[PDB]
Structure 1
Amino acid sequence: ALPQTVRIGTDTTYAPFSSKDAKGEFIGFDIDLGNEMCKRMQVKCTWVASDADALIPSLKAKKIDAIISSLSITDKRQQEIAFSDKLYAADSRLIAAKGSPIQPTLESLKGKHVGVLQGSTQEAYANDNWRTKGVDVVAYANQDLIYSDLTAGRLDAALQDEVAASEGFLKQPAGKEYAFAGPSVKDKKYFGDGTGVGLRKDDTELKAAFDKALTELRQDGTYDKMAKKYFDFNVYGD
């Protein structure tokens, strides 16, 4: 059976998906999706703010029943936990000067300087896929020095999370003469081909319920109405 109340963990440091406003309220597209699915599942849901690194451990330990926290459905994570069907994509993407001919291909990136943030999944992807095939991958301690170096012409491009870059540089005046270079970069091992509700593998009833509610809110147009509040592109991907 489903619990009387489903506890959902989320890392509230990631607008526009999950954050806390000035009154401490949970806000974001994750919160909207979670709340809408819980409504259709007719279960009470309680949001629980958690450190990012504590989400999966808390889930495994049954401190929470679900994770909705832009949790990429990576191959590695699927060794340990289950996921709902995809909620939206969390792929990465190149940013470069507006009009740049750069593409996320080996042929285009050969001999180019591509900035990535130290310790990021973007760094991992670029080091494992591009650095070893003739791309000059430069790792940064500070995200903002990446952007500054891009604007200064010390980088050809920067590999960033797509929505984070969209909301955090491209929408700022500083990013006005910059744009995505090519399409999003997709990889099941690094970016997950989607985010999903993170769930314990044995909780099949809970996953089925989330999956059912999600297809229904997508099919009757609720998904797009909710997404339009935050995004002017196809955030779902796919």
Structure 2
Amino acid sequence: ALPQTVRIGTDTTYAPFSSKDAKGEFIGFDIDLGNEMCKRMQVKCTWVASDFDALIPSLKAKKIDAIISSLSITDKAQQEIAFSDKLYAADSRLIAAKGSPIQPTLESLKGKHVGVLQGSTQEAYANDNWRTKGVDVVAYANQDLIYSDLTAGRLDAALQDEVAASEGFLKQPAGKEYAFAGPSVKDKKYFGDGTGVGLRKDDTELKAAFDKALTELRQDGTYDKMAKKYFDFNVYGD
């Protein structure tokens, strides 16, 4: 009943969770989690690269069978799809040039150019709260474009998952002159409760299989071993 091949869509521009190494192989914590779960589910899995905003449509169209792409578990998303249990926690946070006075507030951001990933919870938040009120919110096909436009000085700030910005950019050579601008942006309704495997609502069996795999690799400590490759903190949360 489970497919012998589970097709998993991911947006490979979100290090350290999902990206590509120099020879084009998919790498990162999402990939590690996905591969470990598939192993324990005893299914073959095929990774499929996609822009983030195409993931849920591809899933609904059955071009893929699952999404592992730091996809936040939100009220809004669950109207369209189902989710596995939580894979890890994910807060949102602004980044900007080091020394910048920028804060995640309308007062600070009005007339500023702020980059967000198209289709993301950050785009939802920024469009509702900031774009309406005169912040130049700029939506991008992928997160790599955002970092590029930031370093080029075309953007004043960018909003994205906190850990991705930190491990994927700030702690990298390209992000040396950048820092977080203000604390995490906390908003329960927009940003959801951690990330999970996104699935078609009727695929209850595939969800059960992922959930079971996830519980097992967390219990035996495999989760923590894989996570320590990327993180010196508790990425899972509570």
**Given the alignment of the two structures, is residue 169 of structure 1 paired with residue 185 of structure 2, yes or no?**
no
Structure 2 Cα separation of the partners of residues 177 and 205 of structure 1 = 47
Aligned to 2:144, what secondary structure does the other structure show?
helix
| Superposed displacement of residue 103, structure 1 | 9.0
Worse overlay, 60-69 or 31-40? 60-69
Question: RMSD in angstroms over aligned alpha carbons?
Answer: 4.1
| Superposed displacement of residue 161, structure 1 | 2.4
Cα 1:200–1:15, aligned 2, differ >3 Å: closer, same or farther?
same
Cα 1:49–1:146, aligned 2, differ >3 Å: closer, same or farther?
closer
Cα 1:60–1:152, aligned 2, differ >3 Å: closer, same or farther?
closer
Unmatched 5+ residue regions in structure 2? none
Structure 1 Cα separation of the partners of residues 23 and 143 of structure 2 = 28
Structure 2 Cα separation of the partners of residues 237 and 131 of structure 1 = 31
The structure having more radius of gyration, on CA atoms, is 1
| Superposed displacement of residue 89, structure 1 | 2.0
After superposition, give the CA deviation of every residue in 1:143-195 in whole Å (9 maximum; x if it has no partner). Answer: 99999999999999875420232024431468668765776334343222111
CA contact (8 A) 2:53 2:141 kept: no
Worse overlay, 220-229 or 49-58? 49-58
CA contact (8 A) 2:72 2:191 kept: yes
Aligned to 1:169, what secondary structure does the other structure show?
helix
Cα 1:108–1:90, aligned 2, differ >3 Å: closer, same or farther?
same
Worse overlay, 7-16 or 194-203? 7-16
Aligned to 1:76, what secondary structure does the other structure show?
helix
Cα 1:154–1:39, aligned 2, differ >3 Å: closer, same or farther?
closer
Worse overlay, 132-141 or 212-221? 132-141
Structure 2 Cα separation of the partners of residues 145 and 125 of structure 1 = 19
Worse overlay, 3-12 or 79-88? 3-12
After superposition, give the CA deviation of every residue in 1:89-145 in whole Å (9 maximum; x if it has no partner). Answer: 222125589999999799999999999789864354256458999999999999999
CA contact (8 A) 1:73 1:192 kept: yes
Structure 1 Cα separation of the partners of residues 143 and 58 of structure 2 = 29
Q: TM-score, normalised by structure 2?
A: 0.74
Cα 1:21–1:77, aligned 2, differ >3 Å: closer, same or farther?
same
Aligned to 2:191, what secondary structure does the other structure show?
coil
Unmatched 5+ residue regions in structure 1? none
| Superposed displacement of residue 65, structure 1 | 1.1
Structure 1 Cα separation of the partners of residues 95 and 110 of structure 2 = 16
